[PDB]
Paper text:
The human SMC5/6 complex is a conserved guardian of genome stability and an emerging component of antiviral responses. Here, we identify a novel SMC5/6 subunit called SIMC1 that contains SUMO interacting motifs (SIMs) and an Nse5-like domain. SIMC1’s Nse5-like domain binds to the putative Nse6 orthologue SLF2 to form an anti-parallel helical dimer resembling the yeast Nse5/6 structure. Thus, two Nse5/6-like complexes with distinct recruitment domains control human SMC5/6 localization.
To evaluate the accuracy of the predicted structures, we performed cryo-EM single-particle analysis on the SIMC1284-SLF2CTD complex. 3D reconstruction yielded an anisotropic and low-quality map, resolving side-chain densities of only bulky residues in the protein core. Nonetheless, the predicted SIMC1-SLF2 model could be docked into the map unambiguously and refined to ~3.9 Å resolution. The refined structure was strikingly similar to the predictions, with r.m.s.d.s of only ~1 Å for Cα atoms, validating the accuracy of the predicted structures. The cryo-EM structure contains 425–858 aa of SIMC1 and 733–1158 aa of SLF2. SIMC1 and SLF2 α-solenoids face each other in a head-to-tail fashion through the concave surfaces of their slightly curved shapes. Overall, the ellipsoid-shaped SIMC1-SLF2 structure resembles the Nse5/6 structure. A notable feature of the SIMC1-SLF2 structure is that the most N-terminal region (425–467 aa) of SIMC1 preceding its α-solenoid adopts an extended conformation, and a short region (431–451 aa) within it adopts a loop-like conformation that inserts into a cleft between the curved SIMC1 and SLF2 α-solenoids. The loop contributes directly to the formation of the SIMC1-SLF2 interface; without this loop, the α-solenoids’ interface would bury a surface area of only ~1500 Å2, but the complete interface including the loop buries ~2500 Å2. The interaction surfaces of both SIMC1 and SLF2 are highly charged.
Author numbering:
A (entry chain B): 733 to 893, 897 to 1033, 1038 to 1158
B (entry chain A): 425 to 628, 654 to 753, 760 to 858
């Protein structure tokens, strides 16, 4: 299709490298080791291996932890199991147990030791075990974590007191369920204990979550809890205004294909003020980037958008790409077929840009003079975009872009007449 | 020393929902209170006009997009729009999966922003029955429809439980799942559950997950049903007797194991196990439910495939029974939910129950007696799996609710 309607996605997870740290045949709460005095611990350390999973699923820990804090390694191993167990029902039950024990302890745990929440090391450990590379987890060299991959691997392995078995992938297909429980638990801890993370930690978490969302085989699975966790995290940050532009640039830098950037613009929630701020600022950054405009410290927005619209003339971009490809191509000769291919590329680019204009234009505060801007804006669309577009029945992409412009015009006209 | 929120409101129903959007309603402070400040409204007339236009030209994708852009914290779609999106698109059997994706996002946004109540719900039990029972229709959107249904039920139950201090007359569960009033619906959901469990696919993969998720959803509906009325005990008894016969005839074992493992309502599983055990014992027992009764069943039960597998199964049933017994004793599930809220807030302690007066010597003697009986009826050495199971039961009994 000349213009696919959804972001192509990319291959983030690799199955053959998924599960290099630990699996379900390696995690036991016996190995943690504690002074066995209460019947709980005595039973646990006298219990077998499958009795462990049986006790977890049927809420035995929840029964036995009504008035006593659960030891931190217990929760850590529960998190590990929820992340790594193949079966869906066992994973859901383990997650339920984790939520229940955490909530109860917190309701009884007034001690300075806050409820356990996986530090960035823990989340990185689980995700890397799932098969996410370190650079994939953190793809912006400017912002990197406080540790390195080797530290994580060695620490997690030694704590888990193995080439013996030919390493099969722990998952031969997208571990949707486990990822969902992990993100749900992350949202829970973020919502219950907001100040448990540092601003830099929050930014790293946003970056890794957004990068993960770009997965190829995750296109068909609705990521609502992703949005919930995003809402919580955005609400958590303390230096908001200062931190916005850095985050915007970070999201901009993740990938090159513009449709993916459009995806991440669409994916962020837009029913909370900070979400709208992020959306509009990210759209501005993207439009600045794509048009080849120099990043010179991007009412004046009205003239800037007018400049853009002038630049988004399909013929203008077509000729620009013609020049660039001719310079690149050793010969510099373009056939009708390759001409039409570049036409498809330019139409795709223009489609994306008009989408970004649609998102940025939306606003809730307006002075009277803003009318004129909108009057100009639509005019530009009519003049700088619509007129240069010539309808061709055999060419549906032209119709798609024309109708898109028509919808933008309709929304802007409605907003204008609302006054 | 951080100002923790009023966490009490999360204890009422700790069981797993489908989505945790409730985290957005925890804060009883300036943020949420000022957010609710504005009085809500419907989609403006002109916006409504354009969206209906979108409806007219059979372009569902445009409808979902436009609705997504227009739905906001100060506006909601008219009920007719919700009905259109659900019936016309979500359960339409022609379009592509991405349309269902966008539809799901749309419904989730609506539910997150606007808490659906009784006077605003869209679906009706007739539609649920159509989508589920009327085979010959393999609707790809069925799973998402069920997820939406369960999410709506859970949200409504939580909201009504919070708001209403002395009644539940205005809840979706009350008027669509109360056993007293619509027991046939309870029968139908139990039938659907046993059907789904019985659906083959395990022998010696993607749709297996579908059956698992729908089964968990049905278990959630049963669990809520067990609480909808005032008294959990009578409803649990009714449900247990209606499901006893159905569970009886399940052909294979793994299906029964899945049925019991997935059980959510602890009281329901306790009652089911007690009823089946009593039905499987020659001499009836008048002792109430307690550890003494657990040993009673342990001794006088029998078998209702080499028999060691059956004995294994009974061992697992007894462990389930003991776990559920501990859970009911600690959670005070017997009382109603509305007053259970006050009970948990006051943090009152449980009390010992008649029939719990046993010592370690008793359990040791009983376990040795059962070992002897099993050897006599089967011999030795026992199957290693059976050995491990009896050992696990030994430790669990040794727990003996040691006070």
């Amino acid at each position: 299709d000349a213009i696919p309607d959804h972001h192509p996605g990319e291959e983030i997870f690799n199955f053959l490298n998924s599960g290099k740290i630990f699996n379900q045949y390696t995690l036991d709460l016996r190995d943690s080791g504690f002074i066995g005095q209460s019947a709980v611990e005595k039973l646990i350390l006298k219990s077998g291996k499958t009795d462990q999973i049986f006790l977890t699923t049927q809420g035995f820990l929840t029964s036995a932890y009504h008035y006593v804090q659960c030891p931190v390694p217990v929760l850590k191993w529960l998190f590990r199991m929820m992340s790594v167990h193949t079966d869906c029902i066992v994973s859901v039950q383990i997650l339920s147990t984790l939520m229940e024990i955490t909530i109860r302890n917190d309701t009884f745990s007034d001690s300075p030791v806050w409820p356990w929440i996986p530090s960035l090391s823990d989340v990185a450990a689980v995700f890397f075990n799932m098969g996410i590379d370190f650079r994939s987890l953190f793809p912006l060299e400017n912002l990197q974590p406080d540790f390195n991959e080797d530290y994580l691997v060695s620490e997690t392995q030694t704590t888990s007191r193995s080439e013996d078995s030919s390493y099969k992938p722990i998952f031969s297909t997208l571990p949707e369920t486990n990822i969902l429980n992990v993100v749900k638990f992350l949202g829970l801890c973020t919502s219950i204990h907001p100040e448990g993370y540092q601003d830099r930690e929050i930014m790293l978490l946003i970056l890794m979550l957004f990068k993960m969302s770009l997965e190829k085989q995750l296109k068909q699975i609705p990521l609502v809890d992703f949005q919930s966790l995003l809402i919580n995290l955005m609400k958590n940050i303390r230096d908001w205004n200062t931190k916005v532009p850095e985050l915007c640039l970070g999201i901009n830098e993740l990938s090159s294909h513009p449709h993916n950037l459009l995806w991440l613009v669409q994916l962020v929630p837009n029913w909370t003020s900070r979400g709208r701020q992020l959306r509009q600022c990210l759209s501005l950054v993207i439009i600045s980037k794509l048009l080849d405009e120099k990043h010179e410290d991007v009412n004046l927005q009205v003239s800037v958008l007018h400049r853009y619209l002038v630049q988004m003339k399909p013929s203008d971009l077509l000729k620009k790409m013609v020049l660039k490809k001719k310079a690149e191509q050793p010969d510099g000769i373009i056939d009708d077929s390759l001409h039409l291919e570049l036409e498809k590329q330019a139409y795709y680019l223009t489609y994306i840009l008009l989408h970004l204009v649609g998102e940025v234009s939306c606003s809730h505060s307006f002075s009277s003079g803003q009318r004129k801007h909108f009057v100009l804006l639509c005019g530009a669309l009519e003049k700088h975009v619509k007129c240069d577009i010539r309808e061709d029945a055999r060419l549906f992409y032209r119709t798609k872009v024309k109708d898109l412009v028509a919808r933008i015009h309709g929304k802007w006209q409605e907003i204008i007449q609302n006054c | 020393l951080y100002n923790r929120p009023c966490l009490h409101r999360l204890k009422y129903f700790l069981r797993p929902p489908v989505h945790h959007l409730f985290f957005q309603t925890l804060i009883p402070d300036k943020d949420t209170r000022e957010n609710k400040g504005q009085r809500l409204e419907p989609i403006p007339h002109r916006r409504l006009r354009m969206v209906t236009n979108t409806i007219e030209e059979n372009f569902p994708l445009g409808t979902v997009q436009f609705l997504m852009d227009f739905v906001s914290p100060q506006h909601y779609p008219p009920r007719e729009i919700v009905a259109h999106i659900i019936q016309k698109i979500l359960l339409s059997g022609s379009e592509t999966v991405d349309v269902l994706k966008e539809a799901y996002m749309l419904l989730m946004k609506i539910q997150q922003l606007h808490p659906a109540n009784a006077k605003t719900v869209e679906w009706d039990w007739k539609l649920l029955t159509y989508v589920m029972e009327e085979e010959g229709q393999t609707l790809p959107g069925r799973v998402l429809f069920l997820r939406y249904v369960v999410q709506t039920l859970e949200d409504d139950f939580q909201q009504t439980l919070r708001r209403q201090r002395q009644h539940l007359q205005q809840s979706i569960a009350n008027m669509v799942l109360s056993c007293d009033k619509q027991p046939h619906n309870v029968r139908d959901v139990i039938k659907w559950l046993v059907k789904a469990v019985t659906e083959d696919g395990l022998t010696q993969n993607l749709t297996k997950n579908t059956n698992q998720l729908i089964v968990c959803q049905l278990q959630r509906m049963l669990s809520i049903a067990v609480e909808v009325d005032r008294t959990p005990t009578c409803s649990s008894n009714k449900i247990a007797e209606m499901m006893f016969g159905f569970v009886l005839d399940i052909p294979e074992r793994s299906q029964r194991e899945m049925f019991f493992t997935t059980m959510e309502s602890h009281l329901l599983r306790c009652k089911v196990l007690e009823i089946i055990f009593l039905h499987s014992c020659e001499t009836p027992t008048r002792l109430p439910l307690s550890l003494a009764q657990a040993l009673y069943f342990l001794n006088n039960s029998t078998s209702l495939k080499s028999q060691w597998q059956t004995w294994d199964e009974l061992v697992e049933r007894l462990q389930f029974l003991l776990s559920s017994y501990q859970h009911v004793l600690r959670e005070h599930l017997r009382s109603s939910v509305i007053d259970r809220k006050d009970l948990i807030i006051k943090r009152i302690k449980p009390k010992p129950q008649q029939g719990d007066d046993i010592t370690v010597v008793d359990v040791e003697k009983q376990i040795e007696a059962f070992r002897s009986r099993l050897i006599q009826m089967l011999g030795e050495p026992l199957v290693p799996q059976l050995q491990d199971k009896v050992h696990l039961l030994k430790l669990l009994l040794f727990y003996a609710a040691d006070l």
